[PDB]
Design a protein around this ligand. Structure first.
Ligand code: ADP
Ligand code: CA
Ligand code: CA
Ligand code: CA
Ligand code: CA
Ligand code: CA
Lengths: 351, 435
């Protein structure tokens, strides 16, 4: 059976749950992190009253999250949580008690043999094959810049921005309604994400790329809705991703993902910065826009010295770099030393 | 009449590399200590962790190298990185962690192996299953090359004749016997390690010189075919102009060319454009994922290189363009070992010519306006948006029309079309499907 004990890994994602068995190329089950009421969970949801447990990358509906974990364990993965150890991901700056209630929830309503909690961004550097670097994990609802040196995070520079995937999709709905369309049937929100994920891209020079949009139709592409209608998206293709660099588009006053990375790197030691500049690893589904690596090299090269080599790292499979990291970490046959046994729970509490 | 002071304004092996080394290799999601017997042998499909402990001036400090093979899967790279932390944490944090990737090893790393490193092509299974080509074989070919001293590497190449290069030596292990091919520019240090490697054969070696290649040789390499036989590579760098490579990119916001020294295949980024100077030829390597802004500026800036050449221009010097995956054996020779499994699907240049049609693989060579100066394409050509003939100003596609056919579509001459208002020009163009 599983005397080797088949392990499990779950990425607690703000908008998408990525989970699977350890030792696999990629997660087997990816389902949205939503709980719905008139129970209703997953893409099966979309009159409803939706809620997001991890809306900002930290769990707030603590016991409500149990239902999501249940949906993962029993229906998506088709597994018995009592027989398999588990690897759970945590945000870069999770509450010290956030982990503890996770520890308890696993050991109680599911009777897991063991468990471990790992930082989402430290897992991402492992898939990249590096120990030193600054990661940008641009997810559905939250983004974090986490400098990591020799395997462990530097919390004096961990930074956070709440501009992410879901905000971009909504801004696309707006500018597309400005283009003269009208899709707000709640189910049609996914059609817009399909438009975003396939036809959008990041521009090296927003102004120049916006000018060519009115003097030509080169950047113009076409999308077939399920009603058979062919709509045309033009300057919106680069406007939606440009919000990440100019948060004023949706109304925020924060800095863009280019400035936050500079601020985070500078809050560190001068000597570790070069490696942090030459190992700017990218993670998250919102770092999968065409050209985001080029602009991030451009913007950072400006705010930085003239003699600093900037290298933006973009692993091809970064939409699941966190999961791929845990599958690597859990499958380590030396991870039993860091597993937390059920006996250790009973003796020491969640601690 | 003045010296711009900005002219002036424009790393070491901490020890001899003679300290102790503990090479661990990533096998089955765990570290397996390599036998001392297999030291100096790394498999390009597996990752390795090396523990170098040294005391300089009575001061014991630690360095942990994690060598990541070019074909090592994501699972092995993470295990290599994850355990370098653990061996660092075991030393309490006293270790400096260094990442090494194949073909770009630092000076201290190669010094740990006395500059003699053998990188087989193969490796253990990735993600926990299947093929384990842990045997070089009874028949393989090795490539000995040295950019500078302290880096004399032997890498397994496909046992084919195309893989042969003139600036380097080769060692063929066959069932019949071991032979050592020698090139016109084979440095002594390269030739030596070949003999040292070939001496391991209980049967011995039979040195062969370029030109004096007997027929029993090619029957083991499958047969003869054009290899890296360029004038620059045959000679020694004492006399031929040093092969140089430049990286052209707009990623910094400004189009720039930056030199890459000790250049190898890994230094090529598929997202930017590169130019290689070989005196006899200047190549333009076009990244498949490269920008059209980058491509054109590189094609032009290459011409500004021939002109400002501080020597004999030889103005008919072929400035040829090459595409990722269609590299000729003479472009690869200025680089070290060329891997076809990366962008050419493991097919030699000849095998590529057969399938891709030879003509399609042919290297093209580099060679605001009035209406006449604009190339006139038919209306049906400009009205489409789908892979139209390149070299078209998609902003002003109206100019690529003829003066005659212009008056049938728009009802006016281009002389009057431009004197019309701008909102009318953009409106009339969109009406005629030429925006
Ligand atoms: N190809 C793509 N292009 C642009 N955005 C994408 C692409 N694929 C996914 N996304 C966006 O990435 C988000 C999911 O990222 P993810 O890493 O799952 O977030 P989290 O880990 O915080 O749950 C989604 O909101 C989606 O809109
Ligand atoms: Ca995430
Ligand atoms: Ca391998
Ligand atoms: Ca250390
Ligand atoms: Ca040589
Ligand atoms: Ca580029």
């Amino acid at each position: 059976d599983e005397d080797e004990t088949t392990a499990l890994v779950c990425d607690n994602g703000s908008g998408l749950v990525k989970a699977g068995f350890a030792g696999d190329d990629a997660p087997r089950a990816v389902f949205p992190s939503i709980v719905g009421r008139p129970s209703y969970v997953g893409d099966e949801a979309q009159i409803l009253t939706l809620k997001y447990p991890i809306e900002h990358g930290i769990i707030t509906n603590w016991d409500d999250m149990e239902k999501i974990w249940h949906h993962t364990f029993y229906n998506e993965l088709r597994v018995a949580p009592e027989e398999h150890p588990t690897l759970l991901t945590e945000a870069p700056l999770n509450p010290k008690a956030n982990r503890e209630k996770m520890t308890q929830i696993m050991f109680e309503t599911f009777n897991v043999p063991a468990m471990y909690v790992a930082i989402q961004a430290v897992l991402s550097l492992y898939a990249s094959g590096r120990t030193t670097g600054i990661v940008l994990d641009s997810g559905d609802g939250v983004t974090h810049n986490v400098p990591i040196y020799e395997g462990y995070a530097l919390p004096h520079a961990i930074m956070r921005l709440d501009l992410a995937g879901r905000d971009l999709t909504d801004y696309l709905m707006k500018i597309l309604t400005e283009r003269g369309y009208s899709f707000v049937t709640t189910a049609e929100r996914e059609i817009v994400r399909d438009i975003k994920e396939k036809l959008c891209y990041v521009a090296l020079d927003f102004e120049n790329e916006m000018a060519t949009a009115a003097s030509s139709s080169s950047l113009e592409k076409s999308y077939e809705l399920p009603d058979g209608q062919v709509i045309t998206i033009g300057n919106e293709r680069f406007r939606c991703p440009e919000t990440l660099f100019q948060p004023s588009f949706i109304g925020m006053e924060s800095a863009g993902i280019h400035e936050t990375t500079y601020n985070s790197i500078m809050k560190c030691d001068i000597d570790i910065r070069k490696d942090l500049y030459a190992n700017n690893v990218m993670s998250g589904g919102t770092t999968m826009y065409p050209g985001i690596a080029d602009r991030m090299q451009k913007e950072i090269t400006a705010l930085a010295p003239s003699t600093m080599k900037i290298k933006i790292i973009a692993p091809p499979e970064r939409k699941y770099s966190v999961w791929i990291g845990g599958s690597i970490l859990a499958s380590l046959s030396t991870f039993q030393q860091m597993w937390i046994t059920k006996q250790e729970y009973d003796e020491a509490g969640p601690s | 009449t003045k010296f711009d002071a900005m002219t002036l304004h424009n790393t070491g092996m901490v020890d001899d590399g003679s300290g102790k080394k503990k090479i661990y290799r990533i096998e089955n999601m765990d570290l397996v200590e390599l036998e001392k017997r297999y030291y100096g042998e790394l498999y390009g499909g597996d990752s390795y962790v090396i523990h170098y402990t040294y005391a300089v001036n009575g001061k014991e400090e630690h360095i942990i190298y994690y060598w990541l093979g070019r074909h090592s899967t994501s699972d092995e790279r993470g295990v290599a990185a994850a355990k370098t932390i653990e061996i660092d944490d075991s030393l309490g944090g006293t270790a400096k962690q260094v990442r090494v990737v194949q073909s770009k090893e630092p000076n201290h790393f190669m010094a740990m192996f006395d500059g003699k490193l053998i990188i087989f092509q193969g490796g253990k299974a990735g993600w926990g299953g299947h093929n384990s080509t842990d045997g070089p074989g009874d028949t393989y070919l090795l490539h000995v090359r040295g950019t500078s001293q302290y880096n004399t590497k032997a890498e397994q190449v496909p046992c084919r004749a195309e893989s042969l290069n003139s600036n380097d030596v080769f060692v063929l292990f066959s069932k019949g016997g071991t032979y050592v091919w020698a090139g016109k520019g084979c440095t002594g240090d390269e030739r030596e390690m070949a003999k040292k490697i070939a001496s391991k054969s209980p049967k011995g070696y039979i040195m062969i010189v370029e030109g004096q290649e007997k027929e029993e040789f090619w029957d083991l390499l499958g047969g003869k075919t054009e290899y890296a036989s360029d004038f620059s590579l045959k000679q020694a760098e004492n006399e031929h102009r040093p092969s140089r490579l430049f990286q052209c990119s707009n990623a910094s916001g400004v189009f720039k060319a930056e030199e890459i020294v000790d250049f190898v295949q890994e230094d090529l980024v598929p997202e930017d454009v590169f130019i290689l100077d070989a005196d006899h030829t200047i190549y333009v390597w076009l990244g498949n994922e490269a920008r059209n802004d980058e491509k054109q500026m590189a094609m032009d800036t290459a011409i500004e290189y021939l002109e400002s050449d501080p020597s004999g221009r030889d103005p008919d010097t072929p400035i040829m363009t090459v595409k990722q995956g269609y590299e000729p054996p003479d472009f690869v020779g200025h680089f070290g070992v060329w891997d076809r499994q990366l962008w050419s699907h493991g097919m030699s240049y000849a095998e590529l010519k057969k399938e891709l049609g030879e003509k399609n693989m042919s290297m093209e060579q580099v060679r605001e306006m009035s209406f006449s100066d604009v190339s006139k394409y038919p209306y049906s050509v400009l009205v489409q948006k789908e892979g139209l003939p390149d070299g078209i100003d998609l902003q002003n596609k109206e100019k690529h029309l003829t003066e005659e056919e212009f008056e049938k579509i728009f009802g006016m001459t281009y002389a009057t079309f431009i004197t019309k208002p701008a909102w009318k020009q953009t409106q009339l163009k969109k009406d005629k499907g030429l925006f």
